[PDB]
Enzyme design. Structure first.
Site, PDB file in Angstrom:
ATOM      1  N   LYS B 202       0.760  -1.146  -0.051  1.00 38.96           N
ATOM      2  CA  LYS B 202      -0.002   0.019  -0.087  1.00 38.96           C
ATOM      3  C   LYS B 202       0.863   1.117   0.041  1.00 38.96           C
ATOM      4  O   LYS B 202       1.708   1.268   0.813  1.00 38.96           O
ATOM      5  CB  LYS B 202      -0.666   0.295   1.173  1.00 38.96           C
ATOM      6  N   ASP B 333     -12.250   1.625   4.898  1.00 36.64           N
ATOM      7  CA  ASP B 333     -11.260   2.360   5.870  1.00 36.64           C
ATOM      8  C   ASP B 333     -11.682   2.317   7.367  1.00 36.64           C
ATOM      9  O   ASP B 333     -11.494   3.514   8.125  1.00 36.64           O
ATOM     10  CB  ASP B 333     -10.832   3.794   5.349  1.00 36.64           C
TER      11      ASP B 333
END
EC number: 3.4.17.-
Lengths: 435, 435, 145, 435
Positions: B202, B333
């Site tokens: 990421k 998230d």
């Protein structure tokens, strides 16, 4: 409006004292409001109660006074796993264990080496569930002491666990703390308190780890032990000393320790000193029993003769302490969720306690293991904390009853039901804390 | 011993990609799905060999959330400081509750884009706790002064903790964040996540309206992004890029990222590129919706105008991507156990997907979020993995059904029941792993 | 995170011991393993072995089925392997590459390694390249056995 | 079934006591089962024995009580080689030396500075062969003490050998340990014990290394020496002090050291104190004899006058100690395999011992050099350890006989033959340990 619960018990074992028949206990919020016969329940509680229960057996929540909150990966057999296991892994695993502990009726653990402080934060904020955790933080050990990881080189170990050289990476917050000298040993105790330690644990003797290791030899100087006690005392903690040989025992006592683990070479002289000075005796017999059950598979001849000699001595020490009427509590040196109940069995079958005295060791006496940090608890009495469990079967007739968790039917911690009929895994009125 | 065979009859079977079946059945053999089709057409060998059958109204794949953060932070610090200050043992405990909770909602796979997924998955895989399949990034990679940086702390504390220089005791290289500047450092940055078992990489490739900070500005150089992709590619991972502004989007694409989060300034040009190159679009709309619901309490006038302007863009971007037929998956998230189901609602009510497309985004498409690290999963098909859930109610008629975990009645992960009638908190045949 | 790394220990302990940064007392640069990431570090990595009197340079250029790890995946970038070869070549050493999967094999060859160990996924194409380029094949079959 | 060996000896020198003629010794497994005349051998041993031997002379395995396990590269003349030589090189070389030692009948070495602990591991696991090695680990020295490497700058030396600043690179495990102050000196002793040190060695005086160096000056404070003794004592080790001048001697004694090396300015007062307090005297005369044989090649006039003055004083000290009946053992301060036998010659020809007393110093007395870490050994007696050697020639008639290793025909260590007729280089029943 106070939340009132009445529990009717066929048999109520209070913890210290004669068990009652046909009894009842009232909980008001977090404390125990009444204990006595069903007949004698005050009428105001019969009026105000929102829930009642009827059970065959009621007693205090159980204590294990010698746990280690490690959560290690399986990979390394020795202490290396403590250093190598990432603490996020450890914490996950410890959550299962504390859940499992509560399901067996263990409402208090005294962690003597590991992450109890760090995991208790997630118990207290309600994210997971578990026993009341009184933690040492790291066990304090001298260089080359029982806490040291001899298989790694010295730099790696003191880099990880020493009280010099502060650095990024949760410095001062591991299962172990190595300190040498009076100066370092002040910071050593202070760093555990920083984490919220509610007891301080020292290694004050060797522990038959290797053949060059000797349980008869003391660890730390008297100068260091004295200072360690004083530091703990100033924050109203006591020190619990790992001791086998008489030299280490005597030094821990002389220093001011108020709890001793194993105490394997305790004799008449030690028993009398412990009674005279109010020092708790935690035998931790389960640890000896583990390597007795291995029977010397892949051990040299004389190294098996050494373990048996220690085991035998540890047995006589414990038996003598019980007979001498030393004050005793129970612990096992296991991970949370481990077989804590076994220690009751050994207290009876090895120690020679009555099942009733065994229960006393795991309840009424056990808070002594944290000295002034103990609330009024471990007993079914008015004003004490509502840590209460119910069983289907009478453990005074078979002390092994505790080893079937199905047999613990109801668990209350602080007046809150964490196990019981129609009650979910995370306890009553549980909500997903991430919504 | 023979294969463990389970037959599930379903009133409605939603396969994940394709038309739902009525009066259908699915067979599990061990870990894989052995048959999907009408009840009538079940092969007779499975009717003979099956050890358990079930009948449920609705059957579909286990759900994915493709943007989670495995942080487990103490509540104390409101910003990113909590990631550094929270001891990972605390984080791990809390994440255990979250993964349990995730499974109970029918979430059988999470893609962790910053935190301890690698470390916690170890305790899922060894059976100590329970949870979704966790594909983790390890630490999110950020440049100094990037979206991952903790601006409130001074720079030395942050790079000490999370930089790829200066190895030291204290679980170096194993936190929620990794800061690396320059081609040399970013090689070790990817390598350090792979070391932990990261199954995706990421990057932060744009700003993120954290201060009166610009989401339009790209982060990392093209040189660094190229190298980061290549490093991941060599171990058969893909890179997922946090991007808002078009410059950051374009650079992440150019570099070879195959997954983009937020993508807030995506336009015609971006949609076509993402289709042309097979790049996953993960809108993460729930994050925008949170600060829309705050409505600018204690924010200056123009900083609230800035959030709405971004929110409006983010909305057009997502809508346009759906209409343009960009391939889409869902994420939120959030912490494990959080409100992952909300994103299905927003996919329908904001994005304008049909409930059926929304389900596809959370199932059949979602494994694309880990590229070559994906097994055949997220679909009810022969040969795919047995990650299967059953619902009481038809979510094609009301997509909000997913937000009541009581509505998910059965959960299978890898052919194993973790939730269902008469099934305990830790799943079928669960044993206390500490005994 | 390569085949030489000790995954069971945390990363700081391993790079502290065996990395090419942070010189210190304690026979720095003189152990069984050297971990280096990036072109800059790999120059000092070869140079440190030559310092000891190394007469060959050994790279891990693929995974090695140590965990449920992939031997098919290459290790080090081509950029690093090229530089490693060149550094060795300048002191008249060759490089020997641990390789299993074809991607790692091909990259070690492309870089200029003149010796390959295991070579487990070698096929027609690899055999011809090794002959064409004079590259030693050391199967190390005892390990498999 | 016990492994029994009978050894018939023309002359049996027991170690402490009158030698026997026409004698025999029986070994049962690892211990000596019988010593006496051939006539008086118990019949059970004549029945059970699997091997017998007949030899002219039998005595204990020899001790050198002052060895250094360094294995240095030849390159640097001074102490720099200890730091610069890689320990893998050192270990290889030390393996030859321990082999060579055993071939000369040296069955025990007390290493007073170096890698004895680390090399003994390869003796005990059977990989190489050698004497019983009782090692100090590193010699403890103050900054600017006799162990310090004056030719290097201070930072390099304390970086390598100090007890602060733990780091990768086998920290705390070298030939030398520098510690200043009570605090540091606790960790200094502890670090040697960590390695398995079986004695602790201090530098307690200067050592005529330079012209600005003075052997008359004491080293370490009394405060540090006291603590060093106490630390060793707690683990059942003793401390051996390097001392020349009377001030250093007196301080080492006062502190509690039980072994002194060189003791070059010992006078009446020291002799009486050593007897009164049971303190071993190890003269290490070979070291003086080396620089007497150089004769002042490239030394200034008065610096050669200084060595002779010391040498003379060292001689009178040793002679006086022998006459005063101080308890004495032998050592040489050499590498393993070095000329240990020379010290017997000097004990007789310089010290004025009888050849018999010289043998006593290298056998019966020598285990005193490790205090409580000594087994019952160094003597041919029932119950003592089977460390036994045989010679072709009578060393009471010529003490230099020991300097021809061909003259030692049989060597037993722990009842196992490591040298003898038809016996291989690695001892009886030796196997290649890498197959």
């Amino acid at each position: 409006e106070a939340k009132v619960t009445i529990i009717y018990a066929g048999l109520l074992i209070p913890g210290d004292g004669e068990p009652l028949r046909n009894a009842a206990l009232v909980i008001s919020d977090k404390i125990i409001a009444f204990v006595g016969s069903e007949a004698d329940i005050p009428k105001k509680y019969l009026r105000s109660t929102q829930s009642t229960h009827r059970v065959p057996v009621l007693m205090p929540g159980l204590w294990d006074c010698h746990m280690h909150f490690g959560g290690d990966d399986d990979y390394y057999n020795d202490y290396t796993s403590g250093l190598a296991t990432h603490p996020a892994s450890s914490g996950a695993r410890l959550a299962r264990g504390c859940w499992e502990a509560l399901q067996n009726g263990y409402t208090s653990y005294r962690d003597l080496a590991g992450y109890g402080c760090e995991v208790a934060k997630a118990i207290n904020d309600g994210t997971i569930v578990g026993p009341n955790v009184y933690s040492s933080g790291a066990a304090l050990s001298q260089t080359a002491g029982h806490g040291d990881i001899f298989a790694l080189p010295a730099g790696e170990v003191l880099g990880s666990y020493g009280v010099m050289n502060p650095r990024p990476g949760y410095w001062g917050a591991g299962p172990l703390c190595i300190a040498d000298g009076v100066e370092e040993v002040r910071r050593a105790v202070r760093l555990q308190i920083r984490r919220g330690a509610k007891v301080i644990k020292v290694m004050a003797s060797g522990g038959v780890m290797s053949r060059d290791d000797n349980p008869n030899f003391a660890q730390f100087s008297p100068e260091e032990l004295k200072v360690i006690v004083e530091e703990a005392a100033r924050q109203n903690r006591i020190v619990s000393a790992h001791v086998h040989g008489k030299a280490g025992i005597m030094a821990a006592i002389k220093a001011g320790c108020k709890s001793l683990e194993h105490v394997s070479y305790a004799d008449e002289e030690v028993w009398e000193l412990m009674k005279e000075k109010g020092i708790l005796y935690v035998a931790t017999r389960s640890v000896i029993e583990i390597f007795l059950a291995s029977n010397g598979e892949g051990l040299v001849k004389e190294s098996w003769a050494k373990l048996q000699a220690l085991a035998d001595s540890h047995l006589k020490a414990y038996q003598g302490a019980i007979k001498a009427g030393v004050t005793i509590a129970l612990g096992t040196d296991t991970a949370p969720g481990g077989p804590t109940a076994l220690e009751l069995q050994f207290a009876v079958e090895r120690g020679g306690m009555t099942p009733l005295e065994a229960i006393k060791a795991a309840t009424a006496n056990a808070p002594l293991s944290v000295g002034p940090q103990a609330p009024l608890t471990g007993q079914l009495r008015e004003g004490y904390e509502a840590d209460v469990i119910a069983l289907e079967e009478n453990p005074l007739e078979d002390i092994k009853v505790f080893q079937e968790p199905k047999a613990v039917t109801h668990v209350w911690k602080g007046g809150k039901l964490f196990k019981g009929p129609g009650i979910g895994p995370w306890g009553e009125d549980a909500r997903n804390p991430f919504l």
